[PDB]
């Protein structure tokens, strides 16, 4: 897939992702906070179409993600992220996608997710997160 | 003076300041690095004119500031930053301004300056720096 | 279980854990690095006995953990950590315990584990890790 790396910011204001219940997550875009002002990150798009869009608007700065979980599994021969769930101190967003395959979860006791990096071909191949106080 | 706060970034690429040898530092602007791309910070300008401009272009990322020093003193009844010197691992930039008053210096053994905040009326009233690994 | 919290240190030199292939992880103790000197953490012991001991001696500071994975599952009605695997830049230690239940994994691209906290009753109930640059 096509690798992307948004880098580190001051916080997260909005997450826009898309998915298809028969396959996996497709598009991924984040609106970050950059020292108090919104910073629109690059839209990381799948090579194909046919994904329902989802908008997660956080009540920044009072609402922030405390846990990210999901599933990775095989789709057409390759391992991809098939599902994602975002839990904030306010509520749970998701699951979005297919909850099948191998689960993973990253609960955070102290700290904040301040950035994302990953790769997308037809679907989200993998992803990593920047953490900071 | 008019307070300003650029916030925290990933590094510093260029510093643009101005001064007058009879008074103090006037204008202050920084080109930051934001995850590998230049990010032009707001130009913080003095209310008056009559300052010689200085451009400090750093060979980012191999060159970075290791020490900031200067002088604060009285100009027309108020305390202001009258002089600044920037020392990198490559060379020394300055002193710029008037080296009179009370000296101050911030040598850094480990870490990086990643942002500035302060206030400017006719001159740079004061300033603070964001530090990070 | 009995909660424990070693806190944050400068690095990890040695990990001592115990387990039983029919149940879960039992004892857990860590030798940390504290500014260049070994710091022996408190031995966190299970209320019962019958666990094979394991000693993981890291070639500190050149060898450090890059991924922690394991399984959590039900043992006698309660959820516990049944298995742990430690992968360093040098080799893989484990799996130790029973690889059954729900998997979890924490790969680290940048940063270090510098501390542990958790709880132990008959077995390791849960655990969290301190991360730092």
């Amino acid at each position: 897939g096509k690798a992307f790396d948004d880098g580190a910011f001051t916080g997260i204001r909005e997450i826009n992702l898309s998915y298809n219940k028969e396959t996996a997550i497709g598009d991924f875009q984040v609106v970050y906070d950059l020292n108090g002002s919104p910073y629109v990150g690059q839209n990381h798009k799948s090579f194909i179409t046919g994904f329902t869009p989802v908008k997660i608007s956080l009540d920044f700065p009072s609402e922030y993600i405390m846990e990210v979980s999901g599933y990775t599994g095989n789709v057409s021969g390759y391992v991809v992220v098939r599902s994602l769930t975002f839990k904030t101190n306010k509520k749970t967003y998701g699951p979005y996608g297919v909850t099948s395959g191998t689960p993973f979860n990253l609960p955070i006791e102290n700290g904040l997710i301040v950035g994302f990096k990953g790769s997308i071909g037809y679907w989200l191949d993998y992803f990593s997160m920047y953490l900071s106080l | 003076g008019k307070a300003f706060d650029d916030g925290a970034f990933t590094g510093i690429r260029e510093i643009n300041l101005s001064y007058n040898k009879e008074t103090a530092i006037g204008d202050f602007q920084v080109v930051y690095d934001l995850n590998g791309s230049p990010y032009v910070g707001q130009n913080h300008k003095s209310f008056i004119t009559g300052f010689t401009p200085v451009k400090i272009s750093l060979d980012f990322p191999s060159e970075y500031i290791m020490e900031v020093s200067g002088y604060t003193g009285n100009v027309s009844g108020y305390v202001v930053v009258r002089s600044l010197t920037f020392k990198t691992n490559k060379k020394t930039y300055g002193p710029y301004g008037v080296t009179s008053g009370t000296p101050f210096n911030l040598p850094i053994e480990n870490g990086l300056i990643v942002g500035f905040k302060g206030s400017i009326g006719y001159w740079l009233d004061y300033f603070s720096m964001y530090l990070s690994l | 279980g009995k909660a424990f919290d070693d806190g944050a240190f400068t690095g990890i030199r040695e990990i001592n854990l115990s387990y039983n292939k029919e149940t879960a992880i039992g004892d857990f103790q860590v030798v940390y690095d504290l500014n260049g000197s070994p710091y022996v953490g408190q031995n966190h012991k299970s209320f019962i006995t019958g666990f094979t001991p394991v000693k993981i001696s890291l070639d500190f500071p050149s060898e450090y953990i890059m991924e922690v994975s394991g399984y959590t599952g039900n043992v006698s009605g309660y959820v516990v950590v049944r298995s742990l695997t430690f992968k360093t830049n040098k080799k893989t230690y484990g799996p130790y315990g029973v690889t059954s239940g729900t998997p979890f994994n924490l790969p680290i691209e940048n940063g270090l584990i510098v501390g542990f906290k958790g709880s132990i009753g008959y077995w390791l109930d849960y655990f969290s890790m301190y991360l730092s640059l």
Binding site: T72, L106, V114, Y126, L131 | L58, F60, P61 | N110, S132
Partner: peptide, 16 residues
């Protein structure tokens, strides 16, 4: 060290 700020990064999850 270089003049680039660092941050803790965890992952990746998905295709290794």
């Amino acid at each position: 060290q270089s003049g680039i700020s660092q941050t803790v990064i965890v992952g990746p999850w998905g295709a290794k």
